[PDB]
Amino acid sequence: TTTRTERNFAGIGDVRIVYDVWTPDTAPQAVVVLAHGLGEHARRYDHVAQRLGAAGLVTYALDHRGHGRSGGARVLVRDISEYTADFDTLVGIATREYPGCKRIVLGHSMGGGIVFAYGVERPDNYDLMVLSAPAVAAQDLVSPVVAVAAKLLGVVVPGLPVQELDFTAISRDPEVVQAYNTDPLVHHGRVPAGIGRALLQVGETMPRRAPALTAPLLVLHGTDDRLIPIEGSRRLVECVGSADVQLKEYPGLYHEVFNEPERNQVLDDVVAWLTERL
Ligand SMILES: O=C(c1ccc(-c2cnc(-c3cccc(OC(F)(F)F)c3)o2)cc1)N1CC[C@@H](O)C1
């Protein structure tokens, strides 16, 4: 059994950042610090934390600013460093509470871009990285017109909507799509300029900064992901400095591999990989 404790801290700008700590009833083997993606929140990761907890891992998971239970204007950000700074605070909380534990940083989609950006800035502050469909090549997905709009408007009017996404592509399971669309904590609007700018900041610098990532790296990606094409993860694993880097491709899976019907197999793979490398 893994128990959830809800806490908060003051993020950049004195925003209230809510986070969960999931603690198993066994001696802790390592600590996972988890970053969710755009428009969602950490309580879409209960089952992930519970599965990791069965492996003896403690999971810290925040709601990013403008998401879920945390404060701030919804999906408002001006710079990727807002997200990575708050992520860094959570890593520091985990480090102080479990100083004898290795640290795993885990991110999905936009959260994978956040974790990647954190990981190249602080490569000695964690031991292992796991990324689910990381949004690290957004420049391939944003048209030239809204790339200009996002880069010129993203700090002046970060809340300005510039594009809509097909949430029905998050999963092959209609129950997952339905639960997403009815979740009051999920953002159901358009993607705003500030998010676009932050996504472009990660993607434009990924090839030049990826060599600084030398920790063991596991990337998970569904081959039928229509939100973040798998080619971006294939490029990522070619650019990182890590010698111990793997991309596990899941044939037929959609974007949210941790929520797909095969999620217990995906999570078995993650736990097996972590077990070998801790
Ligand atoms: O984090 C993510 C996420 C997934 C996918 C994209 C994505 C793909 N293509 C664009 C995109 C493309 C053009 C303009 C644009 O607008 C912007 F220029 F950015 F303003 C954005 O965004 C972004 C975030 N998710 C999905 C739900 C949950 O699984 C967590």
Side-chain angles (χ1 to χ4, degrees), residues 36-40 44-45 108-111 135 138 141-143 146-147 150 162-165 170 180 191-197 199-200 227-228 255-256:
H36 69 78
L38 176 61
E40 54 161 359
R44 299 192 72 230
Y45 291 81
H108 165 71
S109 199
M110 185 177 77
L141 316 185
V142 173
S143 73
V146 355
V162 297
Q163 189 57 270
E164 196 53 280
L165 297 182
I170 65 179
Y180 191 82
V191 187
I195 296 294
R197 181 174 184 269
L199 286 168
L200 290 170
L227 286 167
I228 298 289
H255 183 52
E256 294 181 351

PDB file of all heavy atoms in Angstrom, residues 36-40 44-45 108-111 135 138 141-143 146-147 150 162-165 170 180 191-197 199-200 227-228 255-256, ligand 1:
ATOM      1  N   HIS A  36       4.001  16.253 -14.738  1.00  0.00           N
ATOM      2  CA  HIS A  36       2.903  16.015 -15.669  1.00  0.00           C
ATOM      3  C   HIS A  36       3.013  16.971 -16.857  1.00  0.00           C
ATOM      4  O   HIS A  36       3.845  17.877 -16.879  1.00  0.00           O
ATOM      5  CB  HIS A  36       1.550  16.174 -14.959  1.00  0.00           C
ATOM      6  CG  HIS A  36       1.214  17.584 -14.545  1.00  0.00           C
ATOM      7  ND1 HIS A  36       0.750  18.538 -15.427  1.00  0.00           N
ATOM      8  CD2 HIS A  36       1.251  18.184 -13.328  1.00  0.00           C
ATOM      9  CE1 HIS A  36       0.516  19.665 -14.772  1.00  0.00           C
ATOM     10  NE2 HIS A  36       0.790  19.469 -13.491  1.00  0.00           N
ATOM     11  N   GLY A  37       2.136  16.789 -17.841  1.00  0.00           N
ATOM     12  CA  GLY A  37       2.159  17.592 -19.044  1.00  0.00           C
ATOM     13  C   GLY A  37       1.125  18.711 -19.061  1.00  0.00           C
ATOM     14  O   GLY A  37       0.465  19.029 -18.065  1.00  0.00           O
ATOM     15  N   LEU A  38       0.995  19.315 -20.249  1.00  0.00           N
ATOM     16  CA  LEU A  38       0.149  20.482 -20.448  1.00  0.00           C
ATOM     17  C   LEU A  38      -1.309  20.154 -20.201  1.00  0.00           C
ATOM     18  O   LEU A  38      -1.831  19.183 -20.745  1.00  0.00           O
ATOM     19  CB  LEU A  38       0.308  20.995 -21.872  1.00  0.00           C
ATOM     20  CG  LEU A  38      -0.598  22.169 -22.231  1.00  0.00           C
ATOM     21  CD1 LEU A  38      -0.291  23.372 -21.316  1.00  0.00           C
ATOM     22  CD2 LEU A  38      -0.395  22.468 -23.717  1.00  0.00           C
ATOM     23  N   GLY A  39      -1.951  20.960 -19.365  1.00  0.00           N
ATOM     24  CA  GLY A  39      -3.387  20.894 -19.193  1.00  0.00           C
ATOM     25  C   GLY A  39      -3.851  19.869 -18.192  1.00  0.00           C
ATOM     26  O   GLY A  39      -5.031  19.894 -17.809  1.00  0.00           O
ATOM     27  N   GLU A  40      -2.964  18.985 -17.730  1.00  0.00           N
ATOM     28  CA  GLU A  40      -3.371  17.965 -16.778  1.00  0.00           C
ATOM     29  C   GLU A  40      -2.845  18.319 -15.385  1.00  0.00           C
ATOM     30  O   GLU A  40      -2.758  19.510 -15.042  1.00  0.00           O
ATOM     31  CB  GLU A  40      -2.951  16.588 -17.291  1.00  0.00           C
ATOM     32  CG  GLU A  40      -1.481  16.454 -17.629  1.00  0.00           C
ATOM     33  CD  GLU A  40      -1.013  15.000 -17.696  1.00  0.00           C
ATOM     34  OE1 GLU A  40      -1.821  14.056 -17.457  1.00  0.00           O
ATOM     35  OE2 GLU A  40       0.181  14.797 -17.997  1.00  0.00           O
ATOM     36  N   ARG A  44      -3.662  12.703 -12.229  1.00  0.00           N
ATOM     37  CA  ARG A  44      -3.767  11.709 -13.298  1.00  0.00           C
ATOM     38  C   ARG A  44      -2.655  10.665 -13.243  1.00  0.00           C
ATOM     39  O   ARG A  44      -2.589   9.821 -14.137  1.00  0.00           O
ATOM     40  CB  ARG A  44      -3.783  12.380 -14.680  1.00  0.00           C
ATOM     41  CG  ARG A  44      -4.975  13.335 -14.862  1.00  0.00           C
ATOM     42  CD  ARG A  44      -5.126  13.754 -16.311  1.00  0.00           C
ATOM     43  NE  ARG A  44      -5.623  12.674 -17.170  1.00  0.00           N
ATOM     44  CZ  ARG A  44      -5.066  12.316 -18.318  1.00  0.00           C
ATOM     45  NH1 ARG A  44      -3.942  12.876 -18.751  1.00  0.00           N
ATOM     46  NH2 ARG A  44      -5.673  11.408 -19.076  1.00  0.00           N
ATOM     47  N   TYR A  45      -1.801  10.705 -12.221  1.00  0.00           N
ATOM     48  CA  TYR A  45      -0.681   9.781 -12.082  1.00  0.00           C
ATOM     49  C   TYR A  45      -0.793   8.881 -10.851  1.00  0.00           C
ATOM     50  O   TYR A  45       0.198   8.233 -10.495  1.00  0.00           O
ATOM     51  CB  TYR A  45       0.644  10.568 -12.064  1.00  0.00           C
ATOM     52  CG  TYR A  45       0.899  11.150 -13.423  1.00  0.00           C
ATOM     53  CD1 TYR A  45       0.278  12.340 -13.822  1.00  0.00           C
ATOM     54  CD2 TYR A  45       1.661  10.452 -14.354  1.00  0.00           C
ATOM     55  CE1 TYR A  45       0.474  12.840 -15.110  1.00  0.00           C
ATOM     56  CE2 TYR A  45       1.859  10.940 -15.625  1.00  0.00           C
ATOM     57  CZ  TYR A  45       1.252  12.136 -15.995  1.00  0.00           C
ATOM     58  OH  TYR A  45       1.426  12.604 -17.272  1.00  0.00           O
ATOM     59  N   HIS A 108       6.251  13.501 -18.443  1.00  0.00           N
ATOM     60  CA  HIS A 108       5.421  13.130 -19.590  1.00  0.00           C
ATOM     61  C   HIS A 108       5.094  14.363 -20.431  1.00  0.00           C
ATOM     62  O   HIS A 108       4.606  15.377 -19.907  1.00  0.00           O
ATOM     63  CB  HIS A 108       4.113  12.450 -19.150  1.00  0.00           C
ATOM     64  CG  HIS A 108       3.093  12.380 -20.239  1.00  0.00           C
ATOM     65  ND1 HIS A 108       3.232  11.555 -21.332  1.00  0.00           N
ATOM     66  CD2 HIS A 108       1.944  13.077 -20.435  1.00  0.00           C
ATOM     67  CE1 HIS A 108       2.197  11.721 -22.141  1.00  0.00           C
ATOM     68  NE2 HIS A 108       1.408  12.643 -21.623  1.00  0.00           N
ATOM     69  N   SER A 109       5.328  14.243 -21.740  1.00  0.00           N
ATOM     70  CA  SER A 109       4.902  15.208 -22.758  1.00  0.00           C
ATOM     71  C   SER A 109       5.505  16.570 -22.439  1.00  0.00           C
ATOM     72  O   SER A 109       6.750  16.654 -22.379  1.00  0.00           O
ATOM     73  CB  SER A 109       3.381  15.156 -22.863  1.00  0.00           C
ATOM     74  OG  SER A 109       2.998  15.729 -24.095  1.00  0.00           O
ATOM     75  N   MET A 110       4.708  17.628 -22.228  1.00  0.00           N
ATOM     76  CA  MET A 110       5.317  18.899 -21.833  1.00  0.00           C
ATOM     77  C   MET A 110       6.161  18.729 -20.579  1.00  0.00           C
ATOM     78  O   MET A 110       7.212  19.371 -20.439  1.00  0.00           O
ATOM     79  CB  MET A 110       4.267  19.987 -21.602  1.00  0.00           C
ATOM     80  CG  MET A 110       4.949  21.328 -21.312  1.00  0.00           C
ATOM     81  SD  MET A 110       3.782  22.672 -21.114  1.00  0.00           S
ATOM     82  CE  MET A 110       3.191  22.371 -19.472  1.00  0.00           C
ATOM     83  N   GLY A 111       5.712  17.874 -19.662  1.00  0.00           N
ATOM     84  CA  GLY A 111       6.505  17.566 -18.479  1.00  0.00           C
ATOM     85  C   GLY A 111       7.807  16.862 -18.798  1.00  0.00           C
ATOM     86  O   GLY A 111       8.776  16.969 -18.040  1.00  0.00           O
ATOM     87  N   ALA A 135       8.068  16.325 -24.987  1.00  0.00           N
ATOM     88  CA  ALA A 135       7.799  17.352 -25.989  1.00  0.00           C
ATOM     89  C   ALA A 135       9.088  18.148 -26.168  1.00  0.00           C
ATOM     90  O   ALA A 135       9.254  19.249 -25.643  1.00  0.00           O
ATOM     91  CB  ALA A 135       6.618  18.218 -25.554  1.00  0.00           C
ATOM     92  N   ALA A 138       9.096  20.594 -30.356  1.00  0.00           N
ATOM     93  CA  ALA A 138       7.857  21.290 -30.675  1.00  0.00           C
ATOM     94  C   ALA A 138       7.986  22.150 -31.922  1.00  0.00           C
ATOM     95  O   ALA A 138       6.973  22.445 -32.561  1.00  0.00           O
ATOM     96  CB  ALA A 138       7.414  22.168 -29.493  1.00  0.00           C
ATOM     97  N   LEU A 141       6.264  20.876 -34.905  1.00  0.00           N
ATOM     98  CA  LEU A 141       4.824  20.727 -34.827  1.00  0.00           C
ATOM     99  C   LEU A 141       4.096  22.050 -34.910  1.00  0.00           C
ATOM    100  O   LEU A 141       2.900  22.063 -35.204  1.00  0.00           O
ATOM    101  CB  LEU A 141       4.428  20.043 -33.514  1.00  0.00           C
ATOM    102  CG  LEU A 141       5.277  18.841 -33.114  1.00  0.00           C
ATOM    103  CD1 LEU A 141       4.687  18.197 -31.856  1.00  0.00           C
ATOM    104  CD2 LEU A 141       5.360  17.844 -34.251  1.00  0.00           C
ATOM    105  N   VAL A 142       4.783  23.139 -34.624  1.00  0.00           N
ATOM    106  CA  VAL A 142       4.199  24.471 -34.621  1.00  0.00           C
ATOM    107  C   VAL A 142       4.467  25.090 -35.986  1.00  0.00           C
ATOM    108  O   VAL A 142       5.603  25.072 -36.473  1.00  0.00           O
ATOM    109  CB  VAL A 142       4.801  25.317 -33.489  1.00  0.00           C
ATOM    110  CG1 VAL A 142       4.330  26.748 -33.574  1.00  0.00           C
ATOM    111  CG2 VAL A 142       4.458  24.698 -32.112  1.00  0.00           C
ATOM    112  N   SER A 143       3.415  25.590 -36.626  1.00  0.00           N
ATOM    113  CA  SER A 143       3.562  26.202 -37.934  1.00  0.00           C
ATOM    114  C   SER A 143       4.403  27.469 -37.830  1.00  0.00           C
ATOM    115  O   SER A 143       4.469  28.093 -36.767  1.00  0.00           O
ATOM    116  CB  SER A 143       2.187  26.516 -38.508  1.00  0.00           C
ATOM    117  OG  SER A 143       1.639  27.615 -37.803  1.00  0.00           O
ATOM    118  N   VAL A 146       2.410  30.420 -36.146  1.00  0.00           N
ATOM    119  CA  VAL A 146       2.198  30.536 -34.705  1.00  0.00           C
ATOM    120  C   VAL A 146       3.516  30.439 -33.944  1.00  0.00           C
ATOM    121  O   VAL A 146       3.600  30.945 -32.818  1.00  0.00           O
ATOM    122  CB  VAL A 146       1.113  29.570 -34.175  1.00  0.00           C
ATOM    123  CG1 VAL A 146       0.428  28.811 -35.289  1.00  0.00           C
ATOM    124  CG2 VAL A 146       1.600  28.672 -33.043  1.00  0.00           C
ATOM    125  N   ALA A 147       4.588  29.919 -34.558  1.00  0.00           N
ATOM    126  CA  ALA A 147       5.900  30.053 -33.930  1.00  0.00           C
ATOM    127  C   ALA A 147       6.305  31.516 -33.804  1.00  0.00           C
ATOM    128  O   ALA A 147       6.804  31.942 -32.759  1.00  0.00           O
ATOM    129  CB  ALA A 147       6.962  29.261 -34.705  1.00  0.00           C
ATOM    130  N   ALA A 150       3.967  33.027 -31.110  1.00  0.00           N
ATOM    131  CA  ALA A 150       4.303  32.610 -29.753  1.00  0.00           C
ATOM    132  C   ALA A 150       5.584  33.270 -29.265  1.00  0.00           C
ATOM    133  O   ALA A 150       5.675  33.670 -28.100  1.00  0.00           O
ATOM    134  CB  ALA A 150       4.411  31.085 -29.689  1.00  0.00           C
ATOM    135  N   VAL A 162      -3.402  30.510 -29.134  1.00  0.00           N
ATOM    136  CA  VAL A 162      -2.848  30.494 -30.488  1.00  0.00           C
ATOM    137  C   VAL A 162      -3.145  29.203 -31.244  1.00  0.00           C
ATOM    138  O   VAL A 162      -2.955  29.148 -32.464  1.00  0.00           O
ATOM    139  CB  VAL A 162      -1.327  30.760 -30.484  1.00  0.00           C
ATOM    140  CG1 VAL A 162      -1.020  32.147 -29.939  1.00  0.00           C
ATOM    141  CG2 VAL A 162      -0.598  29.705 -29.698  1.00  0.00           C
ATOM    142  N   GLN A 163      -3.613  28.161 -30.554  1.00  0.00           N
ATOM    143  CA  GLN A 163      -3.803  26.883 -31.236  1.00  0.00           C
ATOM    144  C   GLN A 163      -4.619  25.939 -30.364  1.00  0.00           C
ATOM    145  O   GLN A 163      -4.604  26.039 -29.134  1.00  0.00           O
ATOM    146  CB  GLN A 163      -2.456  26.235 -31.582  1.00  0.00           C
ATOM    147  CG  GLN A 163      -2.542  25.011 -32.480  1.00  0.00           C
ATOM    148  CD  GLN A 163      -3.249  25.298 -33.788  1.00  0.00           C
ATOM    149  OE1 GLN A 163      -4.468  25.155 -33.895  1.00  0.00           O
ATOM    150  NE2 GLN A 163      -2.485  25.720 -34.791  1.00  0.00           N
ATOM    151  N   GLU A 164      -5.315  25.006 -31.012  1.00  0.00           N
ATOM    152  CA  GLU A 164      -6.036  23.954 -30.311  1.00  0.00           C
ATOM    153  C   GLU A 164      -5.466  22.586 -30.668  1.00  0.00           C
ATOM    154  O   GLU A 164      -4.961  22.371 -31.774  1.00  0.00           O
ATOM    155  CB  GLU A 164      -7.537  23.994 -30.614  1.00  0.00           C
ATOM    156  CG  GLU A 164      -8.382  23.182 -29.635  1.00  0.00           C
ATOM    157  CD  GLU A 164      -8.119  23.536 -28.169  1.00  0.00           C
ATOM    158  OE1 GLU A 164      -7.107  23.062 -27.594  1.00  0.00           O
ATOM    159  OE2 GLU A 164      -8.935  24.282 -27.586  1.00  0.00           O
ATOM    160  N   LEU A 165      -5.542  21.668 -29.710  1.00  0.00           N
ATOM    161  CA  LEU A 165      -5.011  20.323 -29.851  1.00  0.00           C
ATOM    162  C   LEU A 165      -6.153  19.319 -29.799  1.00  0.00           C
ATOM    163  O   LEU A 165      -7.207  19.585 -29.221  1.00  0.00           O
ATOM    164  CB  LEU A 165      -4.001  20.008 -28.742  1.00  0.00           C
ATOM    165  CG  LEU A 165      -2.748  20.881 -28.720  1.00  0.00           C
ATOM    166  CD1 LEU A 165      -1.829  20.412 -27.603  1.00  0.00           C
ATOM    167  CD2 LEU A 165      -2.054  20.837 -30.073  1.00  0.00           C
ATOM    168  N   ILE A 170      -5.067  11.543 -26.973  1.00  0.00           N
ATOM    169  CA  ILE A 170      -4.268  11.192 -25.794  1.00  0.00           C
ATOM    170  C   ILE A 170      -4.262   9.687 -25.555  1.00  0.00           C
ATOM    171  O   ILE A 170      -3.291   9.150 -25.014  1.00  0.00           O
ATOM    172  CB  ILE A 170      -4.743  11.919 -24.520  1.00  0.00           C
ATOM    173  CG1 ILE A 170      -6.161  11.464 -24.117  1.00  0.00           C
ATOM    174  CG2 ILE A 170      -4.595  13.441 -24.645  1.00  0.00           C
ATOM    175  CD1 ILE A 170      -6.684  12.124 -22.849  1.00  0.00           C
ATOM    176  N   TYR A 180     -10.741  12.518 -19.167  1.00  0.00           N
ATOM    177  CA  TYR A 180     -10.015  13.764 -19.402  1.00  0.00           C
ATOM    178  C   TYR A 180     -10.977  14.913 -19.668  1.00  0.00           C
ATOM    179  O   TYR A 180     -10.858  15.996 -19.078  1.00  0.00           O
ATOM    180  CB  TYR A 180      -9.066  13.578 -20.578  1.00  0.00           C
ATOM    181  CG  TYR A 180      -8.073  14.701 -20.744  1.00  0.00           C
ATOM    182  CD1 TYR A 180      -6.911  14.737 -19.988  1.00  0.00           C
ATOM    183  CD2 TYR A 180      -8.283  15.699 -21.671  1.00  0.00           C
ATOM    184  CE1 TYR A 180      -5.992  15.756 -20.141  1.00  0.00           C
ATOM    185  CE2 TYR A 180      -7.366  16.729 -21.837  1.00  0.00           C
ATOM    186  CZ  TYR A 180      -6.223  16.747 -21.070  1.00  0.00           C
ATOM    187  OH  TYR A 180      -5.310  17.776 -21.225  1.00  0.00           O
ATOM    188  N   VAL A 191      -4.326  26.268 -26.572  1.00  0.00           N
ATOM    189  CA  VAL A 191      -2.944  26.440 -26.113  1.00  0.00           C
ATOM    190  C   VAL A 191      -2.555  27.906 -26.274  1.00  0.00           C
ATOM    191  O   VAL A 191      -2.721  28.460 -27.371  1.00  0.00           O
ATOM    192  CB  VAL A 191      -1.996  25.537 -26.894  1.00  0.00           C
ATOM    193  CG1 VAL A 191      -0.587  25.611 -26.289  1.00  0.00           C
ATOM    194  CG2 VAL A 191      -2.503  24.096 -26.904  1.00  0.00           C
ATOM    195  N   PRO A 192      -2.054  28.558 -25.224  1.00  0.00           N
ATOM    196  CA  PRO A 192      -1.720  29.981 -25.301  1.00  0.00           C
ATOM    197  C   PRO A 192      -0.266  30.223 -25.695  1.00  0.00           C
ATOM    198  O   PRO A 192       0.573  29.313 -25.691  1.00  0.00           O
ATOM    199  CB  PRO A 192      -1.978  30.460 -23.872  1.00  0.00           C
ATOM    200  CG  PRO A 192      -1.605  29.291 -23.048  1.00  0.00           C
ATOM    201  CD  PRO A 192      -2.017  28.067 -23.832  1.00  0.00           C
ATOM    202  N   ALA A 193       0.020  31.499 -25.998  1.00  0.00           N
ATOM    203  CA  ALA A 193       1.310  31.881 -26.575  1.00  0.00           C
ATOM    204  C   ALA A 193       2.473  31.569 -25.643  1.00  0.00           C
ATOM    205  O   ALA A 193       3.556  31.187 -26.105  1.00  0.00           O
ATOM    206  CB  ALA A 193       1.306  33.373 -26.924  1.00  0.00           C
ATOM    207  N   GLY A 194       2.284  31.754 -24.331  1.00  0.00           N
ATOM    208  CA  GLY A 194       3.380  31.527 -23.399  1.00  0.00           C
ATOM    209  C   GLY A 194       3.829  30.078 -23.374  1.00  0.00           C
ATOM    210  O   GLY A 194       5.031  29.787 -23.334  1.00  0.00           O
ATOM    211  N   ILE A 195       2.861  29.153 -23.377  1.00  0.00           N
ATOM    212  CA  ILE A 195       3.166  27.725 -23.497  1.00  0.00           C
ATOM    213  C   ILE A 195       3.929  27.466 -24.784  1.00  0.00           C
ATOM    214  O   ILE A 195       4.939  26.748 -24.805  1.00  0.00           O
ATOM    215  CB  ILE A 195       1.870  26.896 -23.458  1.00  0.00           C
ATOM    216  CG1 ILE A 195       1.169  27.049 -22.109  1.00  0.00           C
ATOM    217  CG2 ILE A 195       2.158  25.424 -23.800  1.00  0.00           C
ATOM    218  CD1 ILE A 195       1.925  26.476 -20.971  1.00  0.00           C
ATOM    219  N   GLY A 196       3.436  28.034 -25.887  1.00  0.00           N
ATOM    220  CA  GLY A 196       4.133  27.875 -27.145  1.00  0.00           C
ATOM    221  C   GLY A 196       5.573  28.330 -27.059  1.00  0.00           C
ATOM    222  O   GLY A 196       6.475  27.649 -27.546  1.00  0.00           O
ATOM    223  N   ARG A 197       5.811  29.488 -26.439  1.00  0.00           N
ATOM    224  CA  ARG A 197       7.182  29.976 -26.332  1.00  0.00           C
ATOM    225  C   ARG A 197       8.043  29.019 -25.516  1.00  0.00           C
ATOM    226  O   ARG A 197       9.169  28.691 -25.908  1.00  0.00           O
ATOM    227  CB  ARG A 197       7.197  31.372 -25.713  1.00  0.00           C
ATOM    228  CG  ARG A 197       8.596  31.946 -25.588  1.00  0.00           C
ATOM    229  CD  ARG A 197       8.561  33.389 -25.107  1.00  0.00           C
ATOM    230  NE  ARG A 197       9.912  33.935 -25.086  1.00  0.00           N
ATOM    231  CZ  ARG A 197      10.722  33.892 -24.037  1.00  0.00           C
ATOM    232  NH1 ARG A 197      10.321  33.406 -22.871  1.00  0.00           N
ATOM    233  NH2 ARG A 197      11.970  34.335 -24.166  1.00  0.00           N
ATOM    234  N   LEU A 199       7.588  25.804 -25.033  1.00  0.00           N
ATOM    235  CA  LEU A 199       7.810  24.588 -25.803  1.00  0.00           C
ATOM    236  C   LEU A 199       8.897  24.810 -26.847  1.00  0.00           C
ATOM    237  O   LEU A 199       9.753  23.943 -27.066  1.00  0.00           O
ATOM    238  CB  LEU A 199       6.513  24.144 -26.473  1.00  0.00           C
ATOM    239  CG  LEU A 199       5.469  23.509 -25.549  1.00  0.00           C
ATOM    240  CD1 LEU A 199       4.127  23.387 -26.256  1.00  0.00           C
ATOM    241  CD2 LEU A 199       5.970  22.142 -25.127  1.00  0.00           C
ATOM    242  N   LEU A 200       8.884  25.977 -27.491  1.00  0.00           N
ATOM    243  CA  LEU A 200       9.900  26.264 -28.499  1.00  0.00           C
ATOM    244  C   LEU A 200      11.272  26.459 -27.869  1.00  0.00           C
ATOM    245  O   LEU A 200      12.288  26.085 -28.467  1.00  0.00           O
ATOM    246  CB  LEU A 200       9.489  27.492 -29.326  1.00  0.00           C
ATOM    247  CG  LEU A 200       8.304  27.215 -30.254  1.00  0.00           C
ATOM    248  CD1 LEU A 200       7.792  28.518 -30.863  1.00  0.00           C
ATOM    249  CD2 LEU A 200       8.690  26.241 -31.366  1.00  0.00           C
ATOM    250  N   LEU A 227       0.018  13.192 -31.106  1.00  0.00           N
ATOM    251  CA  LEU A 227       0.223  14.494 -30.484  1.00  0.00           C
ATOM    252  C   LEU A 227       1.682  14.893 -30.474  1.00  0.00           C
ATOM    253  O   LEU A 227       2.008  16.042 -30.787  1.00  0.00           O
ATOM    254  CB  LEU A 227      -0.322  14.505 -29.047  1.00  0.00           C
ATOM    255  CG  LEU A 227      -1.849  14.544 -28.934  1.00  0.00           C
ATOM    256  CD1 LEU A 227      -2.314  14.244 -27.508  1.00  0.00           C
ATOM    257  CD2 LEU A 227      -2.376  15.913 -29.387  1.00  0.00           C
ATOM    258  N   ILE A 228       2.567  13.964 -30.122  1.00  0.00           N
ATOM    259  CA  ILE A 228       4.008  14.189 -30.163  1.00  0.00           C
ATOM    260  C   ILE A 228       4.551  13.052 -31.024  1.00  0.00           C
ATOM    261  O   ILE A 228       4.570  11.898 -30.579  1.00  0.00           O
ATOM    262  CB  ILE A 228       4.606  14.209 -28.744  1.00  0.00           C
ATOM    263  CG1 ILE A 228       4.028  15.362 -27.906  1.00  0.00           C
ATOM    264  CG2 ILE A 228       6.106  14.267 -28.778  1.00  0.00           C
ATOM    265  CD1 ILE A 228       4.482  16.749 -28.317  1.00  0.00           C
ATOM    266  N   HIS A 255      -0.636   8.582 -27.311  1.00  0.00           N
ATOM    267  CA  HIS A 255       0.286   9.495 -26.634  1.00  0.00           C
ATOM    268  C   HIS A 255       0.544   9.083 -25.186  1.00  0.00           C
ATOM    269  O   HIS A 255       1.699   8.950 -24.765  1.00  0.00           O
ATOM    270  CB  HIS A 255      -0.299  10.905 -26.707  1.00  0.00           C
ATOM    271  CG  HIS A 255       0.576  11.961 -26.114  1.00  0.00           C
ATOM    272  ND1 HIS A 255       1.901  12.112 -26.462  1.00  0.00           N
ATOM    273  CD2 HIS A 255       0.309  12.929 -25.208  1.00  0.00           C
ATOM    274  CE1 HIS A 255       2.418  13.121 -25.778  1.00  0.00           C
ATOM    275  NE2 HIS A 255       1.466  13.647 -25.028  1.00  0.00           N
ATOM    276  N   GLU A 256      -0.516   8.899 -24.394  1.00  0.00           N
ATOM    277  CA  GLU A 256      -0.348   8.695 -22.955  1.00  0.00           C
ATOM    278  C   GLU A 256      -0.104   7.214 -22.685  1.00  0.00           C
ATOM    279  O   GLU A 256      -1.004   6.465 -22.307  1.00  0.00           O
ATOM    280  CB  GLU A 256      -1.560   9.211 -22.191  1.00  0.00           C
ATOM    281  CG  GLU A 256      -1.720  10.729 -22.300  1.00  0.00           C
ATOM    282  CD  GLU A 256      -2.916  11.268 -21.533  1.00  0.00           C
ATOM    283  OE1 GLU A 256      -3.740  10.468 -21.032  1.00  0.00           O
ATOM    284  OE2 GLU A 256      -3.033  12.505 -21.446  1.00  0.00           O
TER     285      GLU A 256
HETATM  286  O1  LIG B   1       1.818  18.018 -22.503  1.00  0.00           O
HETATM  287  C1  LIG B   1       1.036  17.590 -23.344  1.00  0.00           C
HETATM  288  C2  LIG B   1       1.132  18.127 -24.745  1.00  0.00           C
HETATM  289  C3  LIG B   1       0.992  17.287 -25.843  1.00  0.00           C
HETATM  290  C4  LIG B   1       1.120  17.783 -27.121  1.00  0.00           C
HETATM  291  C5  LIG B   1       1.452  19.118 -27.332  1.00  0.00           C
HETATM  292  C6  LIG B   1       1.512  19.613 -28.694  1.00  0.00           C
HETATM  293  C7  LIG B   1       1.701  19.035 -29.897  1.00  0.00           C
HETATM  294  N1  LIG B   1       1.641  19.997 -30.890  1.00  0.00           N
HETATM  295  C8  LIG B   1       1.428  21.118 -30.260  1.00  0.00           C
HETATM  296  C9  LIG B   1       1.239  22.435 -30.852  1.00  0.00           C
HETATM  297  C10 LIG B   1       1.256  22.575 -32.235  1.00  0.00           C
HETATM  298  C11 LIG B   1       1.043  23.817 -32.803  1.00  0.00           C
HETATM  299  C12 LIG B   1       0.802  24.917 -32.005  1.00  0.00           C
HETATM  300  C13 LIG B   1       0.798  24.786 -30.625  1.00  0.00           C
HETATM  301  O2  LIG B   1       0.519  25.959 -29.877  1.00  0.00           O
HETATM  302  C14 LIG B   1       1.521  26.571 -29.294  1.00  0.00           C
HETATM  303  F1  LIG B   1       2.321  27.097 -30.212  1.00  0.00           F
HETATM  304  F2  LIG B   1       2.208  25.744 -28.535  1.00  0.00           F
HETATM  305  F3  LIG B   1       1.120  27.573 -28.541  1.00  0.00           F
HETATM  306  C15 LIG B   1       0.990  23.544 -30.039  1.00  0.00           C
HETATM  307  O3  LIG B   1       1.339  20.971 -28.905  1.00  0.00           O
HETATM  308  C16 LIG B   1       1.624  19.959 -26.233  1.00  0.00           C
HETATM  309  C17 LIG B   1       1.517  19.456 -24.951  1.00  0.00           C
HETATM  310  N2  LIG B   1       0.013  16.791 -22.997  1.00  0.00           N
HETATM  311  C18 LIG B   1      -1.117  16.372 -23.851  1.00  0.00           C
HETATM  312  C19 LIG B   1      -2.198  16.101 -22.824  1.00  0.00           C
HETATM  313  C20 LIG B   1      -1.405  15.388 -21.741  1.00  0.00           C
HETATM  314  O4  LIG B   1      -1.039  14.095 -22.208  1.00  0.00           O
HETATM  315  C21 LIG B   1      -0.153  16.253 -21.640  1.00  0.00           C
END
